[PDB]
Structure 1
């Protein structure tokens, strides 16, 4: 019979790819369908380029793709419209904001699988040791805490110890970190939903200069090459007070044998001042049936399975990844494992989106401009004021003649 082939999450990021292959195998065993799992690179932008090779070729060699929240506007021609396959009631079981995101010119491109939001991870043992009772609410507090704890831990002999790790590599993860910096300083959304390119302002420039100030001081010099996992590995070894990352890091840090098991909490990222908005960049992944799949019915069945209550439950409980079904946030087992899902649900609901809706199919070009200009501030090549001016100009060229 058919072999249903899935290009799914990466085995290079935590347990995601191992787990996803397990889920696909479980579906194949349940239904008596042969399956194959095709692995992917760690970084989202590398995955997009890989999958574009298959799409350009109209390739039947992958049936189901796991796609980023920022992709529907790019990938829609390559997606089978799922709308006819779901009842209205079935679709309403997902958060409507994500279903809207996944719907392009009426085409339901993909089902919501897991959501994501940037959060602050903090070592609670170390805050207590150094006389702090709460995690930082402002970026200045984060810097002050990081300086004090670093000084102490270095003096105590840990030469590997840093105050803060984050994603500073030039890739899509930096666009996520940078949107959080800019929005949390009152600097806007880089490109507003209305199309206004707003990033050339003093608040956005300040946010970027602040981030530069961390590099080689409270964050490692090498943070300019860090993606999710490079940040996570410094943190997980016990060598960072703070980390910015996504929810998946939580289950991994609690695993038996983790040096930091039981020693951390999570909270919203800090902001410049009490009247700035909280920033948590919206992330998350969706499930797309290929327009080029020879087996649409089987592929849809697999996608509905992976997006189901019990598979999302398993993702929440085992991998601390955020469901796209509101019902799961009241499930007793989800909440007993991850109590912080309730504490931060409003942070996740208020997450700030990258400008993928307004940039549509040009989003990847926009994002490459963002991360390259931000990276130039981090590396010290440019100051934030010049970088936001230069980024404004770049994005203006990219979006010229694009209407949404």
Structure 2
């Protein structure tokens, strides 16, 4: 009978790939359907380039793809419209914001699978050791805490210890980090939902200059090459006071044999001042059935299973990744394992999207301009002032003649 082949999450990021392969294999066993799992590279933009090869070929060799929240406008032609397969009641069990994200020109490109938001990880033991009673609310406070804690830990003999790790590699994750910096300084959304390219302003320039000021100081020089896992591994070994990352790192840090089990908490990222907006970049993944699948019925059944309450529950409990079903945020077991899902739910609700809606199918080009200009600041090659000016010019060229 058919073999349903899934290009799923990466085994190179935490447990996400191993876990998803397990869920796909469980579906195959429950239904008596043969399955195969196709692994992916860690970085989202590398995944996009890989899947674009299959889509260009109209390849039947993948039935289901796990797609980024930033991709529906890019990937829609390659998606089977799921709308005819779900009832209105079924579709209302997911967050409407994500269903809307996934719907392009009325086509439901994909089912919401897990959501994501950038958050601040902090070492509670170290804050207490150095006389701090709360995590930092402003970036200045973050820098002050990091300077003091680093000085003390270095003096105590940990030469591997840093104050802050984050994603500074030139790839999509830096666009995500940089949206948080810029928005939390009151510098806007880079490209606003209305189409205005707003990034050439002094608050956005300051945000980028501030992040440059971290590199080689409170953050490793090598942060300019870090994606999610590089930052996590410094943090997880016990060697960073603070980390900016996504929800998946929490469960990994709590695993038996983690050096930092029981030593950390999470909160909203800091901001420039009390009246700036809180910033958490909206991430997350969706489940798409290929327009090129020879087995759409079976593929749809697998995607519904993966997006189901029980599978999302397992993702939450075991991998600390955020459900797309509001009902799971009140589930007793989800909450007992991850009480911060409740504490941070307003952060998740107010997360700021990258400019994928407005850029549509040109989003990857826009994002490449963003991360490259941002990276030039982090390396000390350009000042923020010049970079936001250059970035404006680039995005103007990229989006010229694009309408949304």
Is the shorter-chain TM-score for this pair beyond 0.5, marking a shared fold?
yes
CA distance in 2: counterparts of 1:225 and 1:328, whole angstroms:
35
Secondary structure at 1:173 match in 2: helix
Structure 1 stretches lacking a partner, 5+ long? none
Task: Return the offset for 1:192.
Answer: 0.1
Q: Deviations over 1:296-315 (max 9, x none)?
A: 00000000000000000000
Task: Return the offset for 1:225.
Answer: 0.0
Task: Return the offset for 1:214.
Answer: 0.1
Q: Deviations over 1:99-122 (max 9, x none)?
A: 000000000000000000000000
Task: Return the offset for 1:394.
Answer: 0.1
Task: Return the offset for 1:245.
Answer: 0.0
Task: Return the offset for 1:353.
Answer: 0.3
Q: Deviations over 1:244-282 (max 9, x none)?
A: 000000000000000000000000000000000000000
Task: Return the offset for 1:9.
Answer: 0.1
Task: Return the offset for 1:325.
Answer: 0.1
Q: Deviations over 1:179-238 (max 9, x none)?
A: 000000000000000000000000000000000000000000000000000000000000
Task: Return the offset for 1:53.
Answer: 0.1
Secondary structure at 2:133 match in 1: coil
Secondary structure at 1:112 match in 2: strand
CA distance in 1: counterparts of 2:121 and 2:296, whole angstroms:
41
Task: Return the offset for 1:350.
Answer: 0.2
CA distance in 2: counterparts of 1:105 and 1:291, whole angstroms:
16
Task: Return the offset for 1:318.
Answer: 0.1
TM-score, normalised with respect to structure 1: 1.00
Structure 2 stretches lacking a partner, 5+ long? none
Structure 2 residue 224 is the aligned partner of structure 1 residue 224: yes
Task: Return the offset for 1:403.
Answer: 0.2
Structure 1 runs (4+) deviating above 2 angstroms are: none
TM-score, normalised with respect to structure 2: 1.00
Task: Return the offset for 1:399.
Answer: 0.1
Task: Return the offset for 1:158.
Answer: 0.1
Task: Return the offset for 1:157.
Answer: 0.2
Task: Return the offset for 1:17.
Answer: 0.1
Task: Return the offset for 1:96.
Answer: 0.1
Give the equivalent residue in structure 1 for 2:190.
190
Q: Deviations over 1:303-354 (max 9, x none)?
A: 0000000000000000000000000000000000000000000000000000
CA distance in 2: counterparts of 1:375 and 1:131, whole angstroms:
34
Structure 2 residue 98 is the aligned partner of structure 1 residue 98: yes
Matches within 5 A, 1:162-311: 162-311=162-311
Q: Deviations over 1:125-148 (max 9, x none)?
A: 000000000000000000000000
CA distance in 1: counterparts of 2:213 and 2:130, whole angstroms:
23
Task: Return the offset for 1:10.
Answer: 0.1
Secondary structure at 1:285 match in 2: strand
Task: Return the offset for 1:396.
Answer: 0.1
Q: Deviations over 1:66-123 (max 9, x none)?
A: 0000000000000000000000000000000000000000000000000000000000
CA distance in 1: counterparts of 2:179 and 2:330, whole angstroms:
30
Secondary structure at 2:89 match in 1: helix
CA distance in 2: counterparts of 1:291 and 1:380, whole angstroms:
45
Secondary structure at 2:344 match in 1: helix
